[PDB]
Design a protein around this ligand. Structure first.
Ligand SMILES: [Cl-]
Lengths: 581, 13
């Protein structure tokens, strides 16, 4: 609504224009900072040309070619100053007008009432502006995205809004339309951030520990992907949501894949509408998508273990980095190494995420060493990503006696790499953020255990219609499994759910045990394995003291790596093997 | 607080 002085003992630094909802000013003035009124979001900036935008993209009336410079002097007053701009070659026009420092950002007017540039300081003072722009202010316009038997993908991107303006917008619209709305976060921490963004709506958070909750007053349910699925498995009460919204819909975690399959089935039913939010839709394969601010891509050899020299660019870099590693174990290596150098590093994995992410948001740090979990929603105030584009993938060895092993380090998918790189280049920075990476990604992940683990979840979810639910379209071509064969009747089914819910066991594992007719309470299968099935912890053969009072070596019948592939999961499987769980 | 605003004028002829 007009023209403001950028005030910062501390006085006026520059001038900005607020037009059509967006705030415009020179780059040198804010130097990248935020402004206050509450806060003002720095969204866009052409750095070299010297200018920044707040709350969206630039707005223009025309260009030059007879003009006034409404100069807002510091400790002075607005005075309309009219002049003809020079025709200097460089094609940039400019005025011969010298106003004192702090004036930078003043509106230049072609004789109507529409701004055709900004006064740039500074031999002569340019009419600073670029090509036609731009995107759109922090208000959202939507369809038509609520009709039954419809599915929509929003590939949201860190501008205005995102988790900021888009989600509350559709929720406001949904409530206005009396739709029982469900929202799905990948992680508690992302759901928590949803709550602040929604503060003021009837939004109830829903624990996994509760199998269903119902009020019959207009409410909006907020849960983790896995909460949904486990409720779909254990609750008898199909709640008939008509709008389902999935934030970060690219999560290939089986509870996610499952959720997506069920949801897609409700849509085809005619029963639901669905919205899937993600920058990398399942089936997408660009590892270099567009981004809100410029990213410098840098292809360079990166340490996979400790190092002592020739990697100066690492330690020399004067800011916060994100480093994706293929594993907790690899991460210790790198952290251990970084710490030699006197670097504040925070480590993240699935298990530790909920208690260790907030440390990144709330304290002075130098490095994050993260597994791929940070591909789901993770938000960082960092400048550089270091991404060796590697990972471990669980595979069911079909080659004789079945087992799950952590294969790799193998290279990541294009999508996974897009997401890792997608940590960076959200906020305008003085230097373009840096994506430092190594190797090409690989797209064939069809032997990934998660696909069949999903079908295991999926075809054990029962619908009143009697339809077996199935994988979301683009994800169907990832198994040759036939719909329904993993279905498990009787209380083999109930066991299969319990082991997952209370036993904390992976899907595949949970499956093999239930379908053998083993009762949850029974734990002998943890000890009746073949010699080559012996678990080891830090290089010693694991022994555990039973609830009936015996020492036996940890040797399960069916071997699934994910129980023994990081102390925290292994601490757990030990408690299960006891009978504490 | 680090920087704020103050409405000075409006866009005119
Ligand atoms: Cl992990």
């Amino acid at each position: 609504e007009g023209v403001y002085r950028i005030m910062q003992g501390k006085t006026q630094v520059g001038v900005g224009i607020h037009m059509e909802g967006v705030f415009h000013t020179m780059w040198h003035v804010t130097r990248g900072s935020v402004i206050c009124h509450g806060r003002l979001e720095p969204s866009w900036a052409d750095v070299r040309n010297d200018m920044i935008s707040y709350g969206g993209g630039w707005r223009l009336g025309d260009k030059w070619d007879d003009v006034q410079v409404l100069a807002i002097e510091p400790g002075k007053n607005p005075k309309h100053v009219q002049t003809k701009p020079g025709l200097f070659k460089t094609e940039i026009g400019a005025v011969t007008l010298d106003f004192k420092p702090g004036t930078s950002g003043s509106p230049i007017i072609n004789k109507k009432g529409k701004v055709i540039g900004l006064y740039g300081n500074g031999y002569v003072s340019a009419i600073t502006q670029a090509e036609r722009i731009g995107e759109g202010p922090d208000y959202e316009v939507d369809e038509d995205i609520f009709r039954k038997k419809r599915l929509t993908i929003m590939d949201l991107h860190p501008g205005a809004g995102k988790t900021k303006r888009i989600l509350p917008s559709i929720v406001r619209e949904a409530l206005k339309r009396r739709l029982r709305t469900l929202i799905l976060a990948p992680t508690r921490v992302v759901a928590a951030e949803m709550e602040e963004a929604l503060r003021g709506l009837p939004i109830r958070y829903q624990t996994p520990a509760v199998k269903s909750d119902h009020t019959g007053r207009e409410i909006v349910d907020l849960m983790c992907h896995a909460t949904f699925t486990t409720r779909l498995l254990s609750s008898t009460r199909v709640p008939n949501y008509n709008l389902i919204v999935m934030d970060e819909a690219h999560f290939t975690d089986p509870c996610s894949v499952a959720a997506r399959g069920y949801i897609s089935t409700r849509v085809e039913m005619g029963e639901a509408a669905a919205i899937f939010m993600t920058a990398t839709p399942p089936g997408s394969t660009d590892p270099f998508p567009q981004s809100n601010s410029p990213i410098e891509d840098i292809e360079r050899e990166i340490p996979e273990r400790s190092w002592n020299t020739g990697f100066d660019w690492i330690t020399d870099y004067q800011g916060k980095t994100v480093w994706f590693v293929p594993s907790i174990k690899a991460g210790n290596d790198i952290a251990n190494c970084l710490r030699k150098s006197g670097k504040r590093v925070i480590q993240l994995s699935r298990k530790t995420f909920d208690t260790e992410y907030p440390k990144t948001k709330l304290t002075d740090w130098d490095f994050v060493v993260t597994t791929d979990i940070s591909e789901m929603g993770a938000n960082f105030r960092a400048g550089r990503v270091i991404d060796p584009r590697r990972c471990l993938k669980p595979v069911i060895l079909t080659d004789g006696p079945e087992r799950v092993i952590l294969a790799g380090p193998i290279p990541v998918t294009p999508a996974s790499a897009a997401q890792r790189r997608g940590r960076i280049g959200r906020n305008p920075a003085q230097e373009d953020d840096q994506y430092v990476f190594s190797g090409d990604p690989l797209k064939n992940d069809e032997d990934h255990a998660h696909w069949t683990e999903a079908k295991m979840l999926l075809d054990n979810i029962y619908t009143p219609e009697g339809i077996i639910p199935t994988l979301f379209g683009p994800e169907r071509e990832k198994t040759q499994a036939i719909d329904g064969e993993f279905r498990l009747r009787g209380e083999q089914r109930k066991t299969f759910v319990e082991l997952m819910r209370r036993g904390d066991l992976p899907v595949w594992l949970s499956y093999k045990v239930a379908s053998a007719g083993i009762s949850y309470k029974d734990r002998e299968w943890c000890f009746t394995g073949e010699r080559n099935n012996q678990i080891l912890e830090e290089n010693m053969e694991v022994e555990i003291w039973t609830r009936e009072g015996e020492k036996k070596k940890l040797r399960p019948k069916w071997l699934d790596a994910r129980v023994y592939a990081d102390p925290m999961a292994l601490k757990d499987f030990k408690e299960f093997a006891s009978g504490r769980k | 607080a680090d920087l704020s605003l103050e409405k000075a004028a409006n866009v005119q002829w």
